[PDB]
Amino acid sequence: MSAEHVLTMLNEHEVKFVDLRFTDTKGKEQHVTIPAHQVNAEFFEEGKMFDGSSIGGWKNESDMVLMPDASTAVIDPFFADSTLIIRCDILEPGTLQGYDRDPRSIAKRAEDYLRSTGIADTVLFGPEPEFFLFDDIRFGSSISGSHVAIDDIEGAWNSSTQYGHRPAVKGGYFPVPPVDSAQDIRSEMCLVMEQMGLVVEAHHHEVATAGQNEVATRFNTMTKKADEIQIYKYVVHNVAHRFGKTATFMPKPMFGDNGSGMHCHMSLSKNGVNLFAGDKYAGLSEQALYYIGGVIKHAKAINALANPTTNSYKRLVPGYEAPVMLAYSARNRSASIRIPVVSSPKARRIEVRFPDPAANPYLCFAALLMAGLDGIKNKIHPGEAMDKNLYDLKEIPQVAGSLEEALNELDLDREFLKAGGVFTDEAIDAYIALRREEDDRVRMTPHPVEFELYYSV
Amino acid sequence: MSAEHVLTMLNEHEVKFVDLRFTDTKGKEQHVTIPAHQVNAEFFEEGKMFDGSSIGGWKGINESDMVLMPDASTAVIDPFFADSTLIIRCDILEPGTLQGYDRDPRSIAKRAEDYLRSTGIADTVLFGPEPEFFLFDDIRFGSSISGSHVAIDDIEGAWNSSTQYGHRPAVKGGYFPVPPVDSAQDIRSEMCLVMEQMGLVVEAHHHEVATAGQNEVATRFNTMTKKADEIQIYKYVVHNVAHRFGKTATFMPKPMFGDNGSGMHCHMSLSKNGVNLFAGDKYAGLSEQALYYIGGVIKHAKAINALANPTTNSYKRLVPGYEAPVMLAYSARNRSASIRIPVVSSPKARRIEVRFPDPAANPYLCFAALLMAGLDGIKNKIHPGEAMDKNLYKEIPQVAGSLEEALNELDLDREFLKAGGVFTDEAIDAYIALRREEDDRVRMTPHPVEFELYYSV
Amino acid sequence: EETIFSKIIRREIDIVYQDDLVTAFRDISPQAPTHILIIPNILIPTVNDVSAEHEQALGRMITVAAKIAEQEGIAEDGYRLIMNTNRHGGQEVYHINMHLLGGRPLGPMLAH
Amino acid sequence: EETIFSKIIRREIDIVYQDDLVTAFRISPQAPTHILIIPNILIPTVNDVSAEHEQALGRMITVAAKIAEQEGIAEDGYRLIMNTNRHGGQEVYHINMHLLGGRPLGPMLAH
Ligand SMILES: *P(=O)(O)OC[C@H]1O[C@@H](n2cnc3c(N)ncnc32)[C@H](O)[C@@H]1O
Ligand SMILES: *P(=O)(O)OC[C@H]1O[C@@H](n2cnc3c(N)ncnc32)[C@H](O)[C@@H]1O
């Protein structure tokens, strides 16, 4: 679309309010609403001034410009009044250039750097988020202690709860519609997503009980796919709220059951041909192997962006169907990087399984793309594939086991993100500080399991 | 003690009632009380006639009465009744003939001892049972057409860490805790004191592995019939002391799932003219007679299982993968062997330890079955084979996996325990019928776990 | 002192092959479908006690192993030569005994 | 024809002990003390051992004992395992005797 198209759409749909939306460093979507009559031709050329001091990690004077993107005009399906959602970029007031800490500006810089390197023209992302549907969640903390309570009908622990078909633990994958009580909610989510520009492939119940559901969305270019992931999170949250449920994208909400993950499919295209298709292992090319090697080498530094929460590392544990070995294979379930089998060379891609849904889409995608580009530029070989049985069987590098370790690796390993000006040093420092605050909070607070273990000793 | 000693004891303690006690086929202790003035010289020569038709397996088509013949050597003052009561254990004898009733367990044990003396192998047999029990604050169970339920509650239970009313033993972690953690120190001390007051000899008492109050009081060995009487006194003492402390004591094999069960390790020793026949120059200091005893126990072990594991719950703890051994082999170091050889300082105390029997077993019947199996092995010279010493270089048999299998084996292999008239075919048939009634009741009723598996399918 | 394999060397008591320094015997309890043992003719307690004097026979052990594998025809299928020592591995002979396991597709090295 | 160990002998590409006919290496630790021994002369498979090069076979175990004394594992227990052809799992396609120890070793093979 364009500015004129948005102006015509305002009259066509009788729009009353225009919502300007943007994403902070944490990944949350912020929005400011303005009346429809306040949108003019000069609005798309000058933007709206706003203060980013209250936004975490964006802190003498913090007056910044909200520049709307007319190509992202989407009618809000949930607001009572007719509202048009326009995604916006954060720009500096004077130079009118992308803010260094703006995730969308960083993603656009990464795409521009990819185009400038001459390696490829476009990058394609295929993330597959997962979410949990709950009826009631209660958490709190104080000097007296802390607690968390998760309750929903589909939970296997409600077999005898006063108020009988519900999924068992680790057995909610593809159940009957009576047991899978999340069919109408998923269908409504798919319809709302299609109303908002998303293309939905399939939706199904996930392995974990207590209402884990997955809605599959078609791939797109990196920045558009990150915007689509933001819209996906928004619609999931709101449609869950409208049905009396609550939706969370937390990686490991409960122990003893499968966690939520975000497998990302990556591909590179130049002049309309797939650069990851060749005659190497699993139908890949030399550039695909270089991309895999670059991802593997900087994977621990990636974890600070693709796994920014401490629950993401309670998911990334040996066992429990969460890959931790940083190898690539087409059949090995333990490999973090997987090469899916496809019918045509045009759809050959590389799948990374360690990222979590709580990750910032822009930052995670930019980090993965920059790692792959560094691997291609430096010609980093991924090594031999982990698809061989050596004498029926520990030097394989492992994904970062804690948020502190990932943040330290990100602090030490910075060049692959600083190449091309995609990630400035100040933005990385601010992100590290923001994540370290949460790490300190989670580390300093006593755990109930600590009481179960070390109260009588 | 003789009848005169019993009369003098009655006069000295101002005893007002005399309790005549005996054990039925199921193992329960049945008692009938009479006034002290009804006890005289002719009482010990003629006994008291009673109707045993109401007893479980003592029914007869002729509805004949039976005689309660007191044993003066078993006189002991009851420590729980408000009035002074003297407990006298009695044997069930047929009228006129004044011979031991065929279905009376004590008469069967006496017959087994007489057969052991008559065969000439040994003069005395020593038993070293080590019963375990659970202490529960409250137990609620029920069954009906609408369903069944069981609920166990105790302060020491690990599940009560959040129950409103904080040192408790963890699951499989109640073995030798600090005095604050285990709340049964005073109860066990009182049990030991009152057991020693009743003629028992106590070695040690301690908390056992399972949570929710599993305790063991060790008692010294004795001859077979006297040791069975001591086991009955042990059960009575445990039950009454638990009742007087506001607790509930159970000798059920596997009251809880996921926690250690209750077992009764039995130690065997044959003595002739004061020397221990089980001491020799064979494996682990054993003799040839001891090896033949082990072989006889192994060969008939399934037949013994009907008497040493009378209950369906007895095979909930005999499932492989727990503390209770299941393999039909003997070793001095291997934990998986059902027959163990304890290490002792002197040959005078060398014994054979069998570990499959449960505390729910009838003491007289279980001891008689084990002794008869050992005697058959000695007479037929059944070599057990080789010890289960795990070397890094003929499938090992196993105990019965269900009560039905053990009952069938007892029905088929009943000749070893019919030698010398220790058991008569009517006794085995009645015992099998009573155990099959319980087996049918357990098998024909729906299980709550079945609803967790076969309700949505 | 000596072991039962010393008696077998003396021929006082299933010989597969005989040589001045190396002999091959069938296992009493074959742990593999084709389990053939190999020992030196000179009594040596452990391989830890091997000196350069008898190191000539140690190569003859492997040569006899190859010859026996070819004779049995298990050369193409594959075989494993195991020579355990000391407390680990269940050394219960206290004499040099090379194991030749073959026929069945064998498992992994060690036990894991 | 030639394997990785062939280039390792030429030093064209973690040596523990080097001899005229025997070289020792430390590459994926399967045991706390996993050290390999190969012949300097290339032998594709142990069945193809010729009597001309059969003398280094004894020096293999001699070096193994020397290493076990050096490694301090001779007081615990060790195995000398040679895998051959497909059933053994010959991966380097060259003679390679494994000196493994440092922890209680299991049985000869896993059932
Ligand atoms: P470990 O290598 O210590 O045990 C060697 C095995 O050799 C077998 N074996 C022992 N004795 C004989 C005889 N006399 N004949 C054939 N095979 C024998 C056993 O399997 C030992 O475990
Ligand atoms: P198989 O019984 O042939 O065992 C294969 C062993 O080869 C070792 N290995 C392969 N490649 C190397 C290199 N480059 N350096 C050292 N060791 C190597 C593996 O350690 C296997 O144990």
Residue numbers in the entry:
A (entry chain A): 1 to 59, 62 to 165, 171 to 400, 406 to 469
B (entry chain B): 1 to 165, 171 to 398, 406 to 469
C (entry chain D): 3 to 15, 18 to 116
D (entry chain C): 3 to 15, 18 to 30, 32 to 116
Describing publication, verbatim:
AMPylation (adenylylation) is an evolutionarily conserved PTM characterized by the covalent addition of adenosine monophosphate (AMP) to the hydroxyl side chains of amino acids in protein substrates. We developed a strategy to enrich for AMPylated proteins using the histidine triad nucleotide-binding protein, hinT. Although its physiological substrates are still unknown, in vitro characterization of hinT revealed high-affinity purine nucleotide binding and phosphoramidase activity. To investigate the structural mechanisms of AMPylated protein binding to hinTHN, we used AMPylated GlnA (GlnA-AMP) as a model substrate.
We solve the cryo-EM structure of an AMPylated protein bound to the nucleotide binding pocket of hinT to provide structural insights into the mechanism of substrate recognition and specificity. Focused refinement of hinTHN depicted the flexible loops of GlnA-AMP extending into the binding pocket of hinTHN. The hinTHN dimer binds two GlnA molecules, with each hinTHN subunit interacting slightly differently. Some interactions are similar between the subunits, such as Ile32 interacting with the adenine group. In addition, Met113 extends into the binding pocket of the neighboring hinT, coming into close proximity with the AMPylated amino acid, Tyr398, of GlnA-AMP. His103 of both subunits are next to the phosphate group of AMP, likely making polar contacts with the oxygens of the phosphate group. The structure of hinT bound to AMPylated GlnA depicts the AMP moiety of Tyr-AMP bound in the nucleotide binding pocket with unique interactions that precisely coordinate the phosphate and purine ring. Notably, Glu96, which is in close proximity to the phosphate moiety in E. coli hinT, is not conserved in human and T. marianensis homologs of hinT. However, the negatively charged glutamate may induce repulsion, contributing to the reduced affinity for AMPylated proteins observed with E. coli hinT. The structure of AMPylated GlnA bound to hinT provides a platform for protein engineering to optimize the binding interface to alter specificity and sensitivity for AMPylated proteins.
